[PDB]
Design a protein around this ligand. Structure first.
Ligand SMILES: O=C(N[C@H]1c2cccc(O)c2C[C@H]1C(=O)O)c1ccc2[nH]cnc2c1
Length: 167
């Protein structure tokens, strides 16, 4: 039993809720919140800009030190950093950004990072400003992630389409 509330159960391990991941993060204090990161961990907009704003820019400060030490992530890769006031940990995962021409097949590799964590609050990778089809992203998620994933979908309209079209 865990503290996630109001989710629709899609599969044995995937749940989905129309929710603001920031607000859901502040209420649940999940062990892991996933950020829709880029390789530079520049949290300027979309989910990343919202999560970082909610941390009063502490996420960005920590991220800049991480990059200065380690260099950029790979597309499809991830790193674990602090969750600040939102979660114990933030798993920064880089899905491909279609608006940069990145290979959508790397989306499966991106979701594989989730399997290193028993339970996660997460957005749909490569959705929103990353330019992929959220329905495809949901399919890859369900077919790749084996751990327990609670997907927060900000847009109510999108959410209802994802539910209604789910196979
Ligand atoms: O842009 C957001 N979400 C999308 C996104 C963004 C970046 C990468 C992604 O893979 C996705 C999936 C989309 C979604 O889940 O709706 C988002 C969320 C909460 C917010 N609060 C204030 N502004 C917010 C913006």
């Amino acid at each position: 039993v865990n503290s996630f509330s109001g989710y629709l159960k899609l599969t044995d391990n995937v749940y989905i809720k129309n929710a603001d991941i920031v607000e859901e993060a502040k209420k649940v204090k999940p062990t892991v919140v996933v950020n829709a990161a880029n390789v530079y961990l520049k949290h300027g907009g979309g989910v990343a800009g919202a999560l970082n704003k909610a941390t009063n820019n502490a996420m960005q400060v920590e991220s800049d030190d991480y990059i200065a030490t380690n260099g950029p992530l790979k597309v499809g890769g991830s790193c674990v950093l602090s969750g600040h006031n939102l979660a114990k940990h933030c798993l920064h995962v880089v899905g491909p950004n279609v608006n940069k021409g990145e290979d959508i097949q790397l989306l499966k590799s991106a979701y594989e990072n989730f399997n290193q964590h028993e339970v996660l609050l997460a957005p749909l990778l490569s959705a929103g400003i990353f330019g992929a089809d959220p329905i495809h992203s949901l399919r890859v998620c369900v077919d790749t992630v084996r751990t327990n994933v609670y997907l927060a979908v900000f847009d109510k309209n999108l959410y209802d389409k994802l539910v209604s079209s789910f196979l």
